[model samples]
Target: ATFEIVNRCSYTVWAAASKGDAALDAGGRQLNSGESWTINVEPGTNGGKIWARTDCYFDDSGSGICKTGDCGGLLRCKRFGRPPTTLAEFSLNQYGKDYIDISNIKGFNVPMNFSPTTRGCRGVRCAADIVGQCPAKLKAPGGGCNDACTVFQTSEYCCTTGKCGPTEYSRFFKRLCPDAFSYVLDKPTTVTCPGSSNYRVTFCPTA
Candidate 1:
């Protein structure tokens, strides 16, 4: 199968993805509007994630920073991103199963959609306009909304010692993007597409 990274935004977007260890081991690029990049994902691959970065600044040597979703200031991400960023996670061909999710549990910066290319599978996305609408209570320093876990860091919010449950903070986010993961206790956010096929991850997709 393959992973297609599509940039449907008005401006350029830096896409990052990874499967095993380092981020973007098989996918990372600067995609302009309406542009796309495809990467092969061998069958048997079971875990990985994809996300977008905004307001990036990189040099010819591929060393720089991103105002949002920066991965250790590397153009080619060698690690997963910090919070306040949207994520599309996947697990394929494990005991003959395929699963996908669009998570906002860490908060959302860019809009993203994860859809399978094959039939019999529905898409999951959080393409809402949440960036500028982020309430002051859940604002991230770098940008985008912040998870209650990140902002409070308290036992209740983080669910460190208590039974994981949603609070007012998670409720607000869930109200905005019901399909996304709002907190650690987030269920109903996962999609079981069963079987296998290539998939597409689009950023800033239009209706």
Candidate 2:
């Protein structure tokens, strides 16, 4: 799949594309509203993920901190952002289909969505204003809601050791984003479509 990142939010967002020419950004190839970046997912035969860093300022050496979605304190990210960040994930050519999803399993830092440009591929999205309505218990630092896994980090919350089940925490996120991954091992969240399709990842889709 040819994946593209689009910035639709009112403010700026530093997008990080990891898993290769290839890995992530800042001052950081900043994407203002209406701007976009094409992320090469060809090298991501295994899998790849992308997300936005909000309110970040990095020095020449890529040193500094982001208000949210910081990755190793680097302006350019080579790894996934720390927890409490929205994520768009994909596994290309999985059984001849490209599996894709908007995952809040780590948490949500922004409102985002995903869709396929090519036919035969159904879109997967979660575009609600989750930050404002985040429950007090699962509230994330700075903004957004923490996943049940992040908040509790237990076998039940994280669904680890094959102990998978949903709790009130997971249910809260699921209620807002029924189509997205709300916790670890979230089922029926990913959508698979024919490979080679062009797909889009958009921040602030409602805006």
Each model's lDDT comes to 0.81, 0.77
TM-score of 2: 0.90
Q: Write the per-residue lDDT of candidate 2 for residues 1-207, one digit (tens) a residue.
A: 566789999999978776532453221356888898876566236557778888888888777877778777877776667768888887787667788888887888888888887899788777877888888987877777778787777888877888688777777778988998776766777888787678888888887
Using lDDT as the measure, the top candidate is: 1
| TM-score between candidate 1 and the true structure | 0.92
What are the per-residue Cα lDDT tens digits for candidate 1 across 88-148? 9888787887889888777788888899988777899888888777888888777688778
Candidate 1: where are CA atoms >4 Å away? none
Global Cα lDDT for candidate 2: 0.77
- What TM-score do all the candidates reach, one by one? 0.92, 0.90
